[PDB]
């Protein structure tokens, strides 16, 4: 229930909170939960940020205001502003968009404060997850 | 990284939309079979999955090309030129060696996707 437009916005937030980051390269295949989907137990703080992010999205999907995501995930996108590494979700976002924007903001901030362990990058999910 | 870069994935997405009207690339060609999505292994479950395996192999070949050495540290700096005309994809001749190779990978996959049957029963599997 996720779209490319949504992923692109999340990527934007990470770029906002973490100057010089390359989101796909850094977070698309890290630990057990950083990337699309996830399984098992998060291996460190950053991985927990991702798992928390995914659970927040699950919560979003359960919101009545997000029912449209069941058949049209690619039809929705929230607005946010980046100012000097600070993320602000737009007041014009509808209930569903606002919740998702907040999930992404919490994740980007979490990523920015969690240690990055190269050893957990490209983890053998078929053994550790 | 797998997929090369977000912008590379976005370009591939645009090319798939060109070849398959009404398609939603991430929704359709992501998390399908054993090869459509992040990496992949095992026996492709169907033609579409084989299209994905081939695309994955192609990106691997790209990263191994001498002309694509810059992709090693700065994969997010790559981008190519192509045109879309009534679902027909044309990789621009101005593309350099590396860009040309990647455009070709994407073009072959987009075409392959457009002719491969889509089996919903192969979505979200496990290979
Ligand atoms: C087949 C064509 C594919 C087209 C895709 C083009 C879009 C490319 C943009 C995506 C790459 C941006 C990289 C951003 C990181 C990926 O983020 C992955 C994941 C997505 O969020 C999952 C959620 F459930 F929360 F919605 O975040 P997380 O689980 O926190 O793990 C980091
Ligand atoms: Ca995840
Ligand atoms: Ca793959």
UniProtKB/Swiss-Prot annotation, chain A:
GO BP terms in the entry: cellular response to insulin stimulus; fatty acid biosynthetic process; intracellular signal transduction; leukotriene biosynthetic process; lipid catabolic process; neutrophil chemotaxis; neutrophil mediated immunity; phosphatidylcholine metabolic process
UniProt-annotated catalytic positions: 53, 104
Pro-sequence residue ranges: 1-5
Regulation: Regulated by bile acid salts. Up-regulated by cholate and down-regulated by taurochenodeoxycholate.
Gene Ontology CC: one annotated term: cell surface
Pfam families: Phospholip_A2_1
Lipid-attached positions, N6-palmitoyl lysine: 61
Disulfide cross-links: 16-82, 32-129, 34-50, 49-110, 56-103, 66-96, 89-101
Principal localisation: secreted
SMART domains: PA2c
Compartments in which it is found: Secreted
Keyword annotations of the record: Autocatalytic cleavage, Calcium, Disulfide bond, Hydrolase, Lipid metabolism, Lipoprotein, Metal-binding, Palmitate, Phospholipid metabolism, Pyrrolidone carboxylic acid, Secreted, Signal, Zymogen
EC number(s) recorded for this UniProt protein: 3.1.1.4
Enzyme class label: hydrolase
Sites where the protein binds Ca(2+): 33, 35, 37, 54
Swiss-Prot/TrEMBL catalytic activity: a 1,2-diacyl-sn-glycero-3-phosphocholine + H2O = a 1-acyl-sn-glycero-3-phosphocholine + a fatty acid + H(+); 1,2-ditetradecanoyl-sn-glycero-3-phosphocholine + H2O = 2-tetradecanoyl-sn-glycero-3-phosphocholine + tetradecanoate + H(+); 1,2-dihexadecanoyl-sn-glycero-3-phosphocholine + H2O = 1-hexadecanoyl-sn-glycero-3-phosphocholine + hexadecanoate + H(+); 1-hexadecanoyl-2-(9Z-octadecenoyl)-sn-glycero-3-phosphocholine + H2O = 1-hexadecanoyl-sn-glycero-3-phosphocholine + (9Z)-octadecenoate + H(+)
Miscellaneous comment text of the record: Loss of activity upon alkylation of His-53 with p-bromo phenacyl bromide; Ca(2+) and Ba(2+) protect against inactivation.
Family from the record: Belongs to the phospholipase A2 family.
Name this protein carries in UniProt: Phospholipase A2, major isoenzyme
Lineage: Eukaryota, Metazoa, Chordata, Craniata, Vertebrata
Gene behind the chain: PLA2G1B
